[PDB]
Amino acid sequence: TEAGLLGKNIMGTGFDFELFVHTGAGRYICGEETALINSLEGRRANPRSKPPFPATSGAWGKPTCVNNVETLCNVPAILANGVEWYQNISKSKDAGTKLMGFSGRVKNPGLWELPFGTTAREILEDYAGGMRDGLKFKAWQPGGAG
Amino acid sequence: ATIHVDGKEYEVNGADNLLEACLSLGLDIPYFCWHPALGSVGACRQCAVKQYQNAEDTRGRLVMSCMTPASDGTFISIDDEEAKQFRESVVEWLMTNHPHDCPVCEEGGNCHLQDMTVMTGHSFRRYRFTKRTHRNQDLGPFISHEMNRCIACYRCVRYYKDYAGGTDLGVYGAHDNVYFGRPEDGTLESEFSGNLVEICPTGVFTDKTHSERYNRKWDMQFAPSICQQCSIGCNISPGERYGELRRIENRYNGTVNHYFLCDRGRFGYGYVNLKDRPRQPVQRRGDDFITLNAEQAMQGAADILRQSKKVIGIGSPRASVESNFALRELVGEENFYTGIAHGEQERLQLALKVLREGGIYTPALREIESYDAVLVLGEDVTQTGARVALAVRQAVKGKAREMAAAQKVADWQIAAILNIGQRAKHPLFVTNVDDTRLDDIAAWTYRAPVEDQARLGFAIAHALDNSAPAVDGIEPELQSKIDVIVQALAGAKKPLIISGTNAGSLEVIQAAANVAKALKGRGADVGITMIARSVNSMGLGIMGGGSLEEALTELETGRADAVVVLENDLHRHASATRVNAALAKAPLVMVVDHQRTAIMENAHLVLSAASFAESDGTVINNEGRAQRFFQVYDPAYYDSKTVMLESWRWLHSLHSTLLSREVDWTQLDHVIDAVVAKIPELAGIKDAAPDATFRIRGQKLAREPHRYSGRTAMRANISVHEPRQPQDIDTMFTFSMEGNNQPTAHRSQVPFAWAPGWNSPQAWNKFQDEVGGKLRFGDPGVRLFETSENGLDYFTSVPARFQPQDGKWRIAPYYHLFGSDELSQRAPVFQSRMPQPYIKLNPADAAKLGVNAGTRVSFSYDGNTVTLPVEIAEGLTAGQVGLPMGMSGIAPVLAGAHLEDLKEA
Amino acid sequence: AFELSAAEREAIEHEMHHYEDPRAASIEALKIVQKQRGWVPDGAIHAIADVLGIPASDVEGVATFYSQIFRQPVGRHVIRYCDSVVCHINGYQGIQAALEKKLNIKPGQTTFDGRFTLLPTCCLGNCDKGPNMMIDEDTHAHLTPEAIPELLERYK
Numbered sequence A: 001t002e003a004g005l006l007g008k009n010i011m012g013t014g015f016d017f018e019l020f021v022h023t024g025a026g027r028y029i030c031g032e033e034t035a036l037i038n039s040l041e042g043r044r045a046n047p048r049s050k051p052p053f054p055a056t057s058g059a060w061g062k063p064t065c066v067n068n069v070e071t072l073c074n075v076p077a078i079l080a081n082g083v084e085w086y087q088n089i090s091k092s093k094d095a096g097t098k099l100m101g102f103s104g105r106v107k108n109p110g111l112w113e114l115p116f117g118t119t120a121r122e123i124l125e126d127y128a129g130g131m132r133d134g135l136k137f138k139a140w141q142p143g144g145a146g
Numbered sequence B: 001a002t003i004h005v006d007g008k009e010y011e012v013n014g015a016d017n018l019l020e021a022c023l024s025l026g027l028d029i030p031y032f033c034w035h036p037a038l039g040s041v042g043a044c045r046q047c048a049v050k051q052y053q054n055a056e057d058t059r060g061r062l063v064m065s066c067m068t069p070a071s072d073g074t075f076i077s078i079d080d081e082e083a084k085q086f087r088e089s090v091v092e093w094l095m096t097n098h099p100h101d102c103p104v105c106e107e108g109g110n111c112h113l114q115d116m117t118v119m120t121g122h123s124f125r126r127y128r129f130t131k132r133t134h135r136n137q138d139l140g141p142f143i144s145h146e147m148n149r150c151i152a153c154y155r156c157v158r159y160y161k162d163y164a165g166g167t168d169l170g171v172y173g174a175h176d177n178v179y180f181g182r183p184e185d186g187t188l189e190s191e192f193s194g195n196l197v198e199i200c201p202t203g204v205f206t207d208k209t210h211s212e213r214y215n216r217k218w219d220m221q222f223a224p225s226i227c228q229q230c231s232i233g234c235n236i237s238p239g240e241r242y243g244e245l246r247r248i249e250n251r252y253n254g255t256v257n258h259y260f261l262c263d264r265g266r267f268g269y270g271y272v273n274l275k276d277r278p279r280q281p282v283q284r285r286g287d288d289f290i291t292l293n294a295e296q297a298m299q300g301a302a303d304i305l306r307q308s309k310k311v312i313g314i315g316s317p318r319a320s321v322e323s324n325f326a327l328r329e330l331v332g333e334e335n336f337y338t339g340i341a342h343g344e345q346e347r348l349q350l351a352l353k354v355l356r357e358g359g360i361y362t363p364a365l366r367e368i369e370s371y372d373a374v375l376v377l378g379e380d381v382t383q384t385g386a387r388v389a390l391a392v393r394q395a396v397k398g399k400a401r402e403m404a405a406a407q408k409v410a411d412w413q414i415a416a417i418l419n420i421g422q423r424a425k426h427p428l429f430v431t432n433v434d435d436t437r438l439d440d441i442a443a444w445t446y447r448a449p450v451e452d453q454a455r456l457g458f459a460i461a462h463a464l465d466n467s468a469p470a471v472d473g474i475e476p477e478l479q480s481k482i483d484v485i486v487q488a489l490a491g492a493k494k495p496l497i498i499s500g501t502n503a504g505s506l507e508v509i510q511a512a513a514n515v516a517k518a519l520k521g522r523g524a525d526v527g528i529t530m531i532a533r534s535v536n537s538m539g540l541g542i543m544g545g546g547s548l549e550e551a552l553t554e555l556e557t558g559r560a561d562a563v564v565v566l567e568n569d570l571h572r573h574a575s576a577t578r579v580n581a582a583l584a585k586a587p588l589v590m591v592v593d594h595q596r597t598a599i600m601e602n603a604h605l606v607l608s609a610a611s612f613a614e615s616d617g618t619v620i621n622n623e624g625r626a627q628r629f630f631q632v633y634d635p636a637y638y639d640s641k642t643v644m645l646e647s648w649r650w651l652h653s654l655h656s657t658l659l660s661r662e663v664d665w666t667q668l669d670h671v672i673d674a675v676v677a678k679i680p681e682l683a684g685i686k687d688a689a690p691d692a693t694f695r696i697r698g699q700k701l702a703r704e705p706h707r708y709s710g711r712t713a714m715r716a717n718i719s720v721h722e723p724r725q726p727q728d729i730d731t732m733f734t735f736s737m738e739g740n741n742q743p744t745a746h747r748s749q750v751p752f753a754w755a756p757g758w759n760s761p762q763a764w765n766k767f768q769d770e771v772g773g774k775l776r777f778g779d780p781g782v783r784l785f786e787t788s789e790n791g792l793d794y795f796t797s798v799p800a801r802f803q804p805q806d807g808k809w810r811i812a813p814y815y816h817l818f819g820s821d822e823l824s825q826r827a828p829v830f831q832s833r834m835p836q837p838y839i840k841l842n843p844a845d846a847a848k849l850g851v852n853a854g855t856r857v858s859f860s861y862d863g864n865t866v867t868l869p870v871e872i873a874e875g876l877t878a879g880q881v882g883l884p885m886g887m888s889g890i891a892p893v894l895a896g897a898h899l900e901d902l903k904e905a
Numbered sequence C: 001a002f003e004l005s006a007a008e009r010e011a012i013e014h015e016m017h018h019y020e021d022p023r024a025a026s027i028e029a030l031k032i033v034q035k036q037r038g039w040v041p042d043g044a045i046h047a048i049a050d051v052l053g054i055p056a057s058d059v060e061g062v063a064t065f066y067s068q069i070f071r072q073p074v075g076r077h078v079i080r081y082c083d084s085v086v087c088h089i090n091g092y093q094g095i096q097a098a099l100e101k102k103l104n105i106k107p108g109q110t111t112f113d114g115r116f117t118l119l120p121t122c123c124l125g126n127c128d129k130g131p132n133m134m135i136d137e138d139t140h141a142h143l144t145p146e147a148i149p150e151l152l153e154r155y156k
């Protein structure tokens, strides 16, 4: 906002955009997009039935678009380097990179950025270092608790 | 639209969802969270059906029928094996935490959860773990709270908050610890909180007044009746057991009061069960009070009345049309007096003239919800005509309904509708002497004396149409508010103007008529609604007669030596000292009434009349609809010494004994025919209900359910010999279960809703043509008059502005839903709910008098000093003092009067 | 008797400036009152409702919906230990046993002197450095049952 990248008349375009940070109060269901909209409106975070989707009538009945942090972090690279660069990062159906990582009693529990189509063995072994000493593999969840 | 359910083709409304479409076709889908008046939310997940994509489809998909539109060419299955298993599983999940409470639960035998547990076929428990429990709250004297029985269907919060506009009920907590109640212990503040006992499908919210003298639904004797506690005319089902009025249930009327009553009509019935009611005719001889039977009372009264030179009759707006007519025929038309005051009668006749000569349609109570802008002039609707206030709230939410309909959102998708129309609402402009309960949704509230509210109405009418008389002396800020109201009213397709006689001002009604005429001249679809005071105020106004002041003048001058007072305490319409003097001077006072009133001390004869629960008759509501109410029980079934007859029966027998020295009692339809022959304006009351010869395939209409119990033991302590079943020669109903209460029976009067498998109030679905619509063969009740071809002229007499004169205090009426109606004060449960009576003062006037909040001030009206504490009313205009109308010692006739010598005691 | 302070009212009103509906500042108003007073007392619900122009039942439903808004009195320091799946694999049970041994209380209870309130909590988003705990504003990772008694004494 000090540098003029946010607020009124952003870089001479005349587009006005105001960005706020709304801190939550500790509930897992608030991550659901309609429950997120309900929580943003100061209500109990019950989800909503779709249709209508939030693109038609979301926050306060207005058109609303909800996106993840990583999607909006993938956006500027697309807008700065081009569509054809983003389509050619990985030779798979899913384009672009993705934050992947193995956690829980591994040698290197962390987070890395990998192209789509990376097999799960390379994340476990070539990046996380495999399992720890004296522990053998039993199971894995690919995308979180759900 | 065309749907195919289980291989059968049906034609349905495409705007409906699948659940209400299938319930209207007679199919049984279990459901909890959906209500016809509240819309669909998809919470309970009970209404699952299997939808197929095409006719040649085997897999399908489980969908919520309440959330799925009944579009053309739909294919669904209710009795699919997977759908049945899922519905049974949902019932089983609800049963895991449910308490073992049915024997000691007031909902037992009337429980929707019981019916859906049986309907899904779930009777085997495999859950073996602990059940969650909850502490209960104290919700006031009317609603009992038991949160263990909750199934978290969210119907209470949806009704109370979204529909009723209440604020003190909510849902708290989380995952399976969801709690439905108030944030703290205390009385539920909504005037329509009593509908929770029918909205809640379990026994969480129950009728505490019924729970005192509890009995099950199958043990009740029901009758279709009309609520007598104001002029709206809501259809009710009173239910009796062991000779006392046990409960008032909502009787569905798709035109009037569809699913909801107000708390005054639901809990104000306790005056029927009072022990001081007259049960036998009593004749006063010196200091002795001898008890007569009916024939001795008729003979003695006839002899004394025949000795008299002129007997006058004083009717009442409490009494039915037939009883007022019978009194009018007994004393003669020239000697009949309406029991209300001259100003009250003038306002009532003006309201009737506006309704049936103004050329503007008057809506029924259900039709009020379809209007686009509402102007309320003078009438505190929530305290005098509460169900009209609820309908006005629905009409206000109509704007969000239209905004969502513009985005192709179905009418049953209530969450999406409320999300689209966030805080936008249709314009509501209310005027009163102080703040109202409609102020939270009102676009503007005008707190002013009744002259200033009338002037605002006249100014609005002049700004809409310049042919109307103008108001001179309007401040520019008030002029800007007037222009806001005019722009909102002129842009409305269906404006509605609501006034009434409770403001105590003729000019307010005249201003409302002028606004309605100005809107009619612009081509708008304007409606007008007048709120009267009592259940048969409009019937007494149509019948006509002299005022109470003329009757008291006739008694005081000696031209009348006999007075017959019909169901009237006479102190609410005239000063008590004048009434007592005129009645003490009269050598014969005969009081026909069902309540122990103060004028019976001066009465030479007291006829023990029947209340509405023990009588049949017709009442005309505020919209001019004639409605028949039927007797619930025989008062003489248990106490054989009780001689308590209908008032028209008493007066007709008295007239017969006066004329021919012989006692003929009557039949009810005979009195109806006499009314429609003598008074042509009341000719519509013949078609309000069919006569006593009406049958359903040869059989009468049952008053009590098929499983009515204890028939050989309920009276066995008095005598082991069973008594003769009480005969009903008056109506088509029978005082037994030997009759018809089929949902498909061709009738409009339904005593109670029961269907096999549907024991709760959801059986009204079986009794309707479509669910949430009208009754299957029409709603009962017939409008007495049509809309007039031509209208009235503009009322030229614009009043001057209110001027506070020194030493005189204008009485501003403050009405209370619990305390202003005469008979509901007598109900013992209302005393804990009735507010303590104070006097309202402006801060400036209280500072001028040197009085604070709570100190006692004494004032004299009609030479009688009474003392009251003080509250400081900020919204009350200075020069006015606010008084609670209809309370003990404060008559409703005091509205618009003046006060002298009001000073600190 | 509850009375909102001037700083609390100013912060709440500035939060209502951020939204097109004043109801949307209810969670932040409850968090402001909780930050100022440790928890949300009974009169704070009615005070926040009066400031925001919404019913008190809505404020109470919001306050009882969210687990991080305390409607019961807590201690001067709130320990929130993660009991989710990755910290279960990394062994939060030893941490919980050490906390219950040192504080001599159960989860959901507070200490006798009002110093500590022990609470389980959902995943803290620090699963690669588990097990994790959150004392009042500081998150601690790589927890061991031996380091818990040392870590507790730095919160007086």
Ligand code: SF4
Pocket (backbone or CB within 6 Å): B098, B099, B100, B101, B102, B105, B106, B107, B108, B109, B111, B112, B113, B114, B149, B201, B202, B203, B204
């Ligand atoms: S609410 Fe219904 S199912 Fe529950 S205890 Fe009462 S009668 Fe039984």
Ligand code: SF4
Pocket (backbone or CB within 6 Å): B149, B150, B151, B152, B153, B154, B155, B156, B157, B180, B199, B200, B201, B202, B204, B205
């Ligand atoms: S209290 Fe009754 S109406 Fe409210 S959610 Fe529970 S079961 Fe439904």
Ligand code: SF4
Pocket (backbone or CB within 6 Å): B227, B228, B229, B230, B231, B232, B233, B234, B257, B261, B262, B263, B264, B265, B266, B385, B386, B387, B388
């Ligand atoms: S609005 Fe009037 S008629 Fe209807 S239930 Fe209430 S008191 Fe009775």
Ligand code: FES
Pocket (backbone or CB within 6 Å): B030, B031, B032, B033, B034, B041, B042, B043, B044, B045, B046, B047, B064, B065, B066, B067
């Ligand atoms: S009635 Fe459809 S989910 Fe509740």
Ligand code: FES
Pocket (backbone or CB within 6 Å): C082, C083, C084, C085, C086, C087, C088, C122, C123, C124, C125, C126, C127, C130, C131, C132
């Ligand atoms: S599982 Fe404990 S921090 Fe995520």
Ligand SMILES: [Ca+2]
Pocket (backbone or CB within 6 Å): B614, B615, B616, B631, B728, B730, B731
């Ligand atoms: Ca009868």
